[PDB]
Amino acid sequence: SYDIQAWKKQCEELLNLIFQCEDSEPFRQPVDLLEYPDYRDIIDTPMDFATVRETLEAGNYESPMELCKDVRLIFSNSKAYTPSKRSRIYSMSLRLSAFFEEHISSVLSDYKSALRFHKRN
Ligand SMILES: CCCCNC(=O)N1CCN(C(=O)c2ccc(C)o2)CC1
Numbered sequence: 001s002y003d004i005q006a007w008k009k010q011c012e013e014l015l016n017l018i019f020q021c022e023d024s025e026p027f028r029q030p031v032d033l034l035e036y037p038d039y040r041d042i043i044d045t046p047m048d049f050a051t052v053r054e055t056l057e058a059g060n061y062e063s064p065m066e067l068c069k070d071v072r073l074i075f076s077n078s079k080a081y082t083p084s085k086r087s088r089i090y091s092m093s094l095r096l097s098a099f100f101e102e103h104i105s106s107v108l109s110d111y112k113s114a115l116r117f118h119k120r121n
Pocket of ligand 1: 025026027029030031032035036077078079081082083087089090
């Protein structure tokens with residue numbers, strides 16, 4: 001399965017599944033600084049799933065590893081901003097992270113395998 005370009009549509013489909021998850025609602029658009037006035041005191045690099053989808057559709061990811069780094073930043077931002085491990089929005093992030101990691105692992109493996117096959121000779 002050595003298609004070097006296959007990751008892009010695989011990531012589009014996984015983003016569609018994440019947008020159908022009720023657990024993604026807080027992560028679909030940038031944090032409102034009006035409602036969370038201290039957000040940018042703590043978070044130096046905002047990230048949301050609409051920004052990830054737009055970056056992918058612009059052709060501004062070279063690899064699924066770059067997309068994976070931005071999605072993991074959504075989750076690390078939620079962990080850094082939460083006042084408690086028992087917060088609603090943080091708990092939604094942990095379930096969504098487990099779902100994302102379960103589905104991205106084959107996308108990364110197949111891409112890296114395809115690149116190794118491309119350089120085989
Ligand atoms: C305007 C449409 C939604 C915008 N998102 C949004 O407001 N947030 C999601 C990110 N965030 C957190 O990760 C987080 C962790 C713990 C708590 C209370 O928030 C801050 C809130």
